[PDB]
Design a protein around this ligand. Structure first.
Ligand SMILES: CCOC(=O)C1CCN(c2cc(C)c3c(OC)cc(OC)cc3n2)CC1
Length: 255
């Protein structure tokens, strides 16, 4: 081990597992439960500013979260790794990758898989929203939903990342329904096996359509109507008109 949590509860090894542009993920270890864990270091190039406090309280609440469909959050602190002031988070290690990576590999999701996994995402979001205070992901997307295994379940990740900062809900040019729009677009990717708004060339062409509430071409490729019906009720332009997660979970398709 070349580094440790202030708590002494966690150990960093010198073995990189991923390299986002803004972060790095090492393999690490919970001395307490002897389970292998993820040691995420993200440059504070964000200059979080005295909003550091906001994260502290966010991060503290995130430790309080435990649910089958939320990747667990263990710890965070501020260190100076490299020359750069940065932030280290410690979170449950997910080995079997993302929904994004899964789609490519299999290149088509079986409608039975999609139901079970999407339901699970709803269940996760439901947990987050029913917290006090409510937690909004603000950033739900396919590469930060993680699977247990190819035959397994999903867990929403990149929870903390959400604070320190592309298709996002139209109104947003936060609140519970921003995540409903996200989920909708996720389920469309999961249904059409391809990325929403692929047709567009530049970001602005996407922003154009989103603003003027034009749906992605993907939308039409949706085979099953009952799914399409749902995705529809999700990516509705007016905040007010979109379904809630309750509405989606109480849906016939789901439970
Ligand atoms: C073979 C490829 O697989 C990998 O290496 C994975 C890379 C991404 N991983 C992460 C990363 C981050 C920043 C997370 C995070 O940030 C707040 C939160 C989180 O839930 C609370 C889970 C997270 N899980 C785990 C390992």
């Amino acid at each position: 081990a070349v580094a440790t949590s202030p708590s002494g509860r966690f150990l960093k090894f010198d073995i990189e597992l991923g390299r986002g542009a803004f972060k790095t993920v090492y393999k690490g270890l919970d001395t307490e439960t002897w389970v292998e864990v993820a040691w995420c270091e993200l440059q504070d190039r964000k200059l979080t500013k005295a909003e550091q406090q906001r994260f502290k309280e966010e991060a503290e609440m995130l430790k309080g979260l435990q649910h089958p469909n939320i990747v667990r959050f263990y710890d965070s602190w501020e260190s100076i790794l490299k020359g750069k002031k940065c932030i280290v988070l410690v979170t449950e290690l997910m080995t079997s990758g993302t929904l994004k990576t899964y789609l490519k590999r299999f290149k088509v999701m079986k409608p039975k898989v999609l139901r079970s996994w999407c339901r699970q995402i709803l269940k996760g979001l439901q947990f987050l929203h029913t917290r006090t205070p409510p937690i909004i992901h603000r950033d739900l997307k396919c590469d930060n939903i993680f699977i247990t295994g190819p035959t397994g379940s999903v867990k929403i990740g990149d929870l903390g990342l959400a604070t320190l900062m592309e298709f996002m809900a139209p109104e947003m040019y936060y609140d519970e329904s921003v995540d409903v729009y996200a989920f909708g677009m996720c389920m469309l990717e999961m249904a059409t096996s391809e990325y929403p708004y692929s047709e567009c060339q530049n970001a602005a062409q996407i922003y154009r359509k989103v603003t003027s509430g034009i749906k992605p071409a993907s939308f039409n490729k949706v085979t099953d109507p009952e799914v399409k019906e749902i995705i529809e009720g999700c990516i509705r332009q007016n905040k007010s008109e979109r379904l809630s997660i309750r509405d989606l979970l109480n849906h016939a398709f789901f439970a």
